[PDB]
Structure formats: C-alpha cells, structure tokens
Design a protein around this ligand. Sequence first.
Ligand SMILES: CN1CCO[C@@H](CNc2nccs2)C1
Length: 185
Amino acid sequence: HHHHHHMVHITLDRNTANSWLIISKDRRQVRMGDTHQNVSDNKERFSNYPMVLGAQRFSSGKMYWEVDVTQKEAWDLGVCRDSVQRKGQFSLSPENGFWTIWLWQDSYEAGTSPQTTLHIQVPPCQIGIFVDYEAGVVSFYNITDHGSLIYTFSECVFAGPLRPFFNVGFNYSGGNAAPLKLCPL
Ligand SMILES: CN1CCO[C@@H](CNc2nccs2)C1
C-alpha cells in the first residue's frame, strides 16, 4: 500500500477513557491499570470495557495511522462514530457505529455482524489503519508483513464524524498487560 503519505498524528482523549486506563504524558500510549485510576466519572467514559478514543475527529479526506500491539493477547482497533454508546454492554459492529478488527484467543476477526474470520500468516506487531471518508472505506494493514492487507470495510455508512478507537483488552490472564502505542510517522 502507498497510504503512508496520509499519515496523521493521533493523540488519546483522557476524558473518554475507561477509569482503569493509564495514558502516557505524551497521550500516545495506553495500558490497563491493576485498579481504578482515581479519576471522576463523566458521560464520555466507556464504562464496561477498557476502551478510549483519539482526540481527533474526521469528517472528510484520507487519514492513516499505525498502532503497536507487541506481546498483547487481546485488543480491538479501528474507528467509530463520535456518537457511539459509552455505557453498558454493546457489540462492535457497523450497525452500532464501529469499524474494527480484533485479536482474541489466538484468532483475528473483523467486527462485522456476525464477525468475520481473518487470515493472517504473520502475527502483526504493528497495524496500519486507513480511512477514506468520501469513499466509505476503512482498511487494515499488517506492517510486520510488508504492509499486506488484513481487511477492508467498504460501502461504510459513517453517518457522522469519526474518531480513532482503541480497546487494550482485559488482563484476566496476566499475559495482556502490554500497552497499545501510537507509532511515530
Ligand atoms: C459494574 N459493571 C459496570 C462497568 O463494567 C463492568 C466491568 N467492566 C470493567 N471493569 C474494569 C474496567 S472495565 C462492571
């Protein structure tokens, strides 16, 4: 792929984070803490899952960024509508305003409804995410495997401004503590 020149500098929005997340000073890394992080509650915070949004909002154009997922067992990545539900239980689907992929239990899947099996021969350490707002496309690339395509959502009905979306996953196993990191341009 030749999407690298649409690179955008993404930072995480603390106010949207689940109350157990720890975001670095530079707002470029996030990990699951072992307890509540001593923040006040607000209507933006994801309550049920270890999720956070990027600060940036996109309503046009082409955007690209990269995320490091090294040594994680579970995570979700992609984009979502600014108006997604924050409280209670929900599934990651385009009907609910999410365009995502994930790792869970040693398999990769796209967040369609129902979910779609991904075919990845080289487990990725860094994921590239490309959004073409006008075309209605969200694509995912395997940076570890020379940029190979993982998945394309096409005919997307965004229906609002988009935000970068992250889930660091739970750490019930003790093997999923590692952070998500936004990689330098
Ligand atoms: C009372 N419910 C409502 C909120 O989510 C449920 C568990 N989820 C999380 N706990 C830690 C961080 S995310 C507990």
